[PDB]
Enzyme design. Structure first.
Site, mmCIF file in Angstrom:
data_model
loop_
_atom_site.group_PDB
_atom_site.id
_atom_site.type_symbol
_atom_site.label_atom_id
_atom_site.label_comp_id
_atom_site.label_asym_id
_atom_site.label_seq_id
_atom_site.Cartn_x
_atom_site.Cartn_y
_atom_site.Cartn_z
ATOM 1 C CG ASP A 1 1.717 5.010 5.028
ATOM 2 O OD1 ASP A 1 1.458 3.803 4.838
ATOM 3 O OD2 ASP A 1 2.582 5.384 5.838
ATOM 4 C CG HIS B 1 5.163 0.904 3.161
ATOM 5 N ND1 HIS B 1 4.706 2.066 2.579
ATOM 6 C CD2 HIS B 1 4.527 0.805 4.351
ATOM 7 C CE1 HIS B 1 3.840 2.647 3.398
ATOM 8 N NE2 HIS B 1 3.710 1.896 4.477
ATOM 9 C CG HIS C 1 -0.122 0.106 2.516
ATOM 10 N ND1 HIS C 1 0.625 -0.943 3.009
ATOM 11 C CD2 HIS C 1 0.086 1.149 3.354
ATOM 12 C CE1 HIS C 1 1.237 -0.551 4.115
ATOM 13 N NE2 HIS C 1 0.931 0.717 4.341
HETATM 14 N N1 BCV Z 1 -7.592 3.850 11.814
HETATM 15 C C1 BCV Z 1 -6.649 4.949 11.486
HETATM 16 C C2 BCV Z 1 -6.028 4.713 10.119
HETATM 17 C C3 BCV Z 1 -5.421 3.314 9.932
HETATM 18 C C4 BCV Z 1 -4.829 3.193 8.524
HETATM 19 C C5 BCV Z 1 -4.160 1.818 8.366
HETATM 20 O O1 BCV Z 1 -4.768 0.745 8.494
HETATM 21 N N2 BCV Z 1 -2.851 1.779 8.158
HETATM 22 C C6 BCV Z 1 -2.011 0.574 8.020
HETATM 23 C C7 BCV Z 1 -1.104 0.863 6.828
HETATM 24 S S1 BCV Z 1 -0.077 2.348 7.102
HETATM 25 C C8 BCV Z 1 -1.174 0.362 9.293
HETATM 26 O O2 BCV Z 1 -1.286 1.137 10.247
HETATM 27 N N3 BCV Z 1 -0.280 -0.613 9.388
HETATM 28 C C9 BCV Z 1 0.757 -0.777 10.446
HETATM 29 C C10 BCV Z 1 1.241 -2.194 10.673
HETATM 30 O O3 BCV Z 1 0.574 -3.060 10.083
HETATM 31 O O4 BCV Z 1 2.211 -2.368 11.437
HETATM 32 C C11 BCV Z 1 1.826 0.331 10.169
HETATM 33 C C12 BCV Z 1 2.415 1.714 9.842
HETATM 34 C C13 BCV Z 1 2.868 0.957 11.091
HETATM 35 C C14 BCV Z 1 -7.283 6.359 11.403
HETATM 36 O O5 BCV Z 1 -8.523 6.414 11.518
HETATM 37 O O6 BCV Z 1 -6.514 7.334 11.243
HETATM 38 FE FE FE2 Z 2 1.916 2.027 5.809
#
Ligand code: BCV
Ligand code: FE2
Length: 329
Positions: free
Chosen positions: A214, A268, A212
């Site tokens: 960000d 990433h 994805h």
């Molecule tokens: N729920 C959050 C947004 C979440 C967005 C999301 O799901 N992001 C993923 C991809 S960046 C995520 O947080 N993944 C983590 C992981 O799987 O360890 C990442 C970046 C540390 C909001 O409302 O701001």
């Molecule tokens: Fe991410």
């Protein structure tokens, strides 16, 4: 094997001060990293990350199933229709390993004008019972402001890097209205680890979260010292080294939009690792009505053929799209 990604460590401490020349030298390092793999580690950032990790562990390891339902976002609990973003994201044993707790701007109180208006992407945070989690809410709210401060400093560096005045992004990143979020993610150790909770990339790599870009301006991330992230480069996917003393920084797709892909949002993904660990992102989001006019630092006149996009539009659409692509977390 997989090659190691170039992820430089940049001492960002001058971005908190008034030495303008020193700030430009930091800006150049940010520019270089943003044009290369798209990731760097911010070091000398001034945040007590060991304490962050300890307080987060205390929370993750003491919260009960009862409390998780009571805090759950609407994806898990239909009674909580106002909780789209903020609250608990449950694991599903045998199917989904990851679980997390998301919170937003502590200034989004019931009397906040955006809360009163019921504007999309604004919510009032939910918290566990204070007696069950003494000090947790206060710690977590203070953390929001500590990482907000770091992020503001980083945004001065990105602005200078792009040939702008240092408040170019930061003037849109304000305590009273930022849509920034913290997510406290727990990745568990499981024995056996259910195959349904492991995804497989086209190249055969076992993943916890697929490729994805960000949904952010920038992303400011603390993780445990367990290697897991990979970034796609021209040379293929490369491993990002862990460093639990620094913050891993990258651009999101709003930065890519504003800069006409001069600073790309790096693609990433998260490898599957059977390890108890933490991933604690801060998503640097602007205000709902924030609009920065797109530009292009590779063009003599700086002009871009992209149209202005309000941050609220960007965010609401991006979060839904990410759920549709890579699943409800
Ligand atoms: N729920 C959050 C947004 C979440 C967005 C999301 O799901 N992001 C993923 C991809 S960046 C995520 O947080 N993944 C983590 C992981 O799987 O360890 C990442 C970046 C540390 C909001 O409302 O701001
Ligand atoms: Fe991410």
């Amino acid at each position: 094997s997989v090659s190691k990604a170039n992820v430089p460590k940049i001492d960002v401490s001058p971005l908190f001060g008034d030495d303008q020349a020193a700030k430009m030298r930091v800006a150049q390092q940010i520019d270089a990293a943003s044009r290369d793999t798209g990731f760097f580690y911010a070091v000398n950032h001034g945040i007590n990350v060991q304490r962050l990790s300890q307080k987060t562990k205390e929370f993750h390891m003491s919260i009960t199933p009862e409390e998780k339902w009571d805090l759950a976002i609407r994806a898990y609990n239909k009674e909580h229709q106002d909780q789209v973003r903020a609250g608990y994201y449950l694991s599903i044993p045998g199917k989904k390993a990851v679980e997390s707790f998301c919170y937003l701007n502590p200034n989004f109180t019931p009397d906040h004008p955006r809360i009163q208006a019921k504007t999309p992407t604004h919510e009032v945070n939910v918290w566990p019972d204070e007696t069950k989690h003494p000090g947790f809410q206060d710690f977590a709210e203070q953390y929001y402001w500590d990482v907000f401060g770091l992020s503001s400093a980083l945004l001065k560096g990105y602005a200078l890097a792009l040939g702008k005045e240092e408040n170019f992004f930061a003037r849109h990143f304000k305590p009273d209205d930022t849509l920034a979020s913290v997510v406290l993610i727990r990745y568990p150790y499981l024995d056996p680890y259910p195959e349904a909770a492991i995804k497989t990339a086209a190249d055969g790599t076992k993943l916890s979260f697929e490729w994805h870009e960000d949904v952010s301006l920038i992303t400011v991330l603390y993780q445990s010292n367990v290697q897991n992230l990979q970034v796609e480069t021209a040379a293929g996917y490369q491993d990002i080294e862990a460093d639990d003393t620094g913050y891993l920084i990258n651009c999101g797709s709003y930065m890519a939009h504003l800069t006409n892909n001069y600073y790309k949002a790096p693609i990433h993904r998260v490898k599957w690792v059977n390890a108890e660990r933490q991933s604690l992102p801060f998503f640097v989001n602007l205000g709902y009505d924030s609009v920065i006019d797109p530009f292009d630092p590779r063009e003599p006149n700086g002009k871009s053929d992209r149209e202005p996009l309000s941050y609220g539009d960007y965010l609401q659409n991006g979060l839904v799209s990410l759920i549709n692509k890579n699943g409800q977390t």
